[PDB]
Design a protein around this nucleic acid. Structure first.
Length: 614
RNA sequence: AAAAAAAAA
């Protein structure tokens, strides 16, 4: 069918990816590394247990035995690492990374001492690809189970079965607006597929939660997935507010801290498993004797553990995991197939479609939510990107079916209408609407915050042109750093706390840049890329487009959705700092600066900076 | 061409 060609082409697009990633891996011989994908002169600096009965050790670099340190390749939280003294000393996972620390959670096996020197290696992992391969296959080789119907629908085979016409709804959330209502109504009344298209600020998660509550009222069992841990946990922390009985699939690493309590790991540590661990010590006391043994009784952990987690999985109404966390080799394997009734994928338009097929083969209905007019899933292979990996299951369907399967939230509760309209008129067909409560709010309306030229204006653009604030293989721009700084200080002086402000540029260079010249004078001020700031919001957001050159080159500021995302992070105030001259060679980017100048209060670097040779 | 994130026993 369409599947046994989809799956066959999709595996292709997939190997193009793995390969394009094993390229920029095996390419960049033991110094070029620490830049980088490696940490050396690591001294051990703390040892404890935690999370949950693991070995949490902390490290810090030791130049000539003292500073500093760390230049790490972000070496971000949740990364799998090596650890060397010889060769492979163990394996563990990354809890946090400071520019002084890095802490790693070891799953135990032995110590390990202060009076040594260590190395730490970011390892690569084939699991995400392995499981994506395994998904697609199963989709290909699907008999006649429950997902069968839904499959046909997501692939043209057959059309959408009619409405299940749920008896009208007593809503838990009464302050719900009408778009959200037709949405919720419609999702529960489908039968194979409902798509919640939720633009920035429309309360898409208020809407999904409401859906899930109804589902549990009808006595339905739910799998709730998303591509990232951050997004799952969004839902996990909202479900938990509504008292719902919920389980979140480990590893707790990895997991929002406010919520460890809900991971399969914590539940399992609330017994009954003072017994299973009572003998965890057994097995460790017979690798000692020594001087068929363990096998004899490791059959006991199998049943015991798999007994408890089967129980816990059963006693929850909503089970939550990452798309790839719902792998048929994860805890979901203890459930008979036919266990879940619906599967919600939040942030679907932001995830490889092949992942979605992991959680998707487990229900016979699914709700998809997200905003395909913001960032698509990331692709390392340009070639796959053109071939359509960067296409989301949600987008594809949205393009195909339209209002036959999509319901779209329209009142938004974040942005002042000025900001609101750009994105609206620009990316969402001129249909967004401010809630009568956000449409006129500015920073001067905040408490402690004085009225001011800035704190009193929703939009603002300070121009690089033509003061020759040129750039300089990511992209920085000293002229812009400098500028934000001042506007930053204009905001913090007018009252605005830094905790309520964020600075966002598209390039990682401008970021470290911005950070270096900012972190110390404003510790609680978030500085991050646009891709590292999705879903977030702030009272005031300072953008930095960075690109200024005579050549007219915008880089990837051309990717429309990125820009959209960026502008929509602001509630009461977005100040864009770009170069009029260069930025204008891209239509979208132009009608933006055009907007900022029609209904905005604009300025030119001139008003801000002393040295001026045009 | 582009320089951007995920995920993970």
């Amino acid at each position: 069918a369409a599947v046994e060609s989809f799956v066959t082409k999709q595996l292709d697009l997939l190997e193009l990816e793995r390969d394009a990633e094993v390229e920029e891996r095996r390419s960049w011989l033991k110094e070029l590394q620490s830049r980088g994908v490696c940490l050396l002169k690591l001294q051990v600096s703390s040892q404890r247990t935690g999370l949950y009965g693991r070995l949490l050790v902390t490290f810090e670099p030791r130049r000539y035995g003292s500073a500093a340190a760390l230049p790490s390749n972000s070496f971000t939280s949740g990364d799998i690492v090596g650890l060397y003294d010889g060769s492979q000393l163990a394996t563990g996972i990354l809890t946090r990374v400071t520019q002084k620390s890095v802490t790693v959670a070891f799953d135990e096996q032995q110590s390990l001492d202060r009076e040594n020197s260590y190395r730490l290696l970011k390892l690569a992992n084939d699991v995400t690809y392995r499981r994506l391969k395994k998904a697609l296959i199963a989709l290909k080789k699907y008999h006649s189970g429950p997902a069968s119907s839904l499959i046909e629908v997501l692939f043209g085979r057959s059309a959408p079965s009619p409405a299940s016409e749920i008896h009208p709804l007593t809503f838990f959330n009464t302050c719900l607006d009408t778009s959200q209502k037709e949405a919720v109504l419609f999702a529960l009344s489908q039968k194979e597929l409902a798509i919640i298209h939720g633009p920035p600020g429309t309360g898409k998660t208020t809407t999904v939660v409401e859906i899930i509550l109804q589902a549990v009222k009808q006595g339905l069992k739910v799998l709730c997935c998303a591509p990232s841990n951050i997004a799952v946990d969004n839902l996990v922390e909202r479900l938990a507010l509504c008292k719902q009985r919920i389980l979140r699939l480990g590893h707790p690493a990895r997991l929002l801290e406010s919520i460890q309590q809900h991971s399969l790991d914590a539940v399992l540590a609330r017994s009954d498993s003072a017994q299973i661990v009572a003998d965890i010590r057994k097995d460790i006391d017979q690798v000692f004797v020594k001087n068929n043994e363990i096998k004899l009784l490791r059959k006991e952990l199998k049943e015991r553990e798999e007994a408890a987690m089967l129980e816990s999985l059963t006693s929850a109404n909503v089970v939550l995991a990452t798309n790839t966390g719902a792998s048929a080799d994860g805890p979901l394997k203890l459930l008979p197939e036919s266990y879940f009734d619906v599967v919600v994928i939040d942030e679907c338009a932001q995830a490889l479609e092949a992942s979605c097929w992991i959680p998707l083969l487990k229900a016979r209905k699914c709700i998809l939510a997200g905003d395909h007019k913001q960032l698509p899933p990331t692709t390392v292979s340009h070639k796959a990107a053109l071939a359509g990996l960067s296409l989301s299951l949600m987008e594809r369907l949205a393009e195909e079916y339209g209002a036959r399967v999509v319901r779209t939230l329209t009142v938004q509760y974040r942005m002042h209408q000025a900001i609101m309209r750009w994105a609206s008129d620009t990316m969402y067909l001129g249909q967004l609407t401010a809630h009568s409560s956000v449409a006129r709010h500015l920073l001067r309306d905040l408490p402690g915050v004085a009225a001011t030229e800035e704190t009193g204006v929703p939009l603002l653009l300070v121009d690089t042109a033509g003061c020759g604030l040129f750039e300089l293989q990511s992209k920085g721009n000293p002229g812009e750093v400098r500028l934000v700084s001042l506007h930053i200080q204009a905001l913090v002086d007018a009252g605005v706390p830094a905790r309520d402000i964020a600075v966002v540029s598209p390039y990682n260079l401008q970021v470290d840049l911005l950070r270096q010249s900012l972190v110390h004078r404003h510790p609680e001020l978030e500085i991050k890329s646009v891709d590292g700031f999705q879903g977030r919001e702030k009272e005031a957001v300072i953008l930095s487009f960075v690109r200024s050159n005579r050549k007219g080159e915008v880089g990837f500021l051309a990717e429309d959705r990125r820009i959209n995302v960026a502008v929509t992070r602001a509630r009461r105030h977005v100040a864009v700092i770009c170069d009029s001259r260069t930025v204008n060679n891209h239509a979208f980017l132009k009608t933006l600066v055009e907007y900022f100048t029609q209904h905005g209060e604009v300025r030119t670097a001139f008003e801000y900076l002393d040295d001026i040779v045009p």
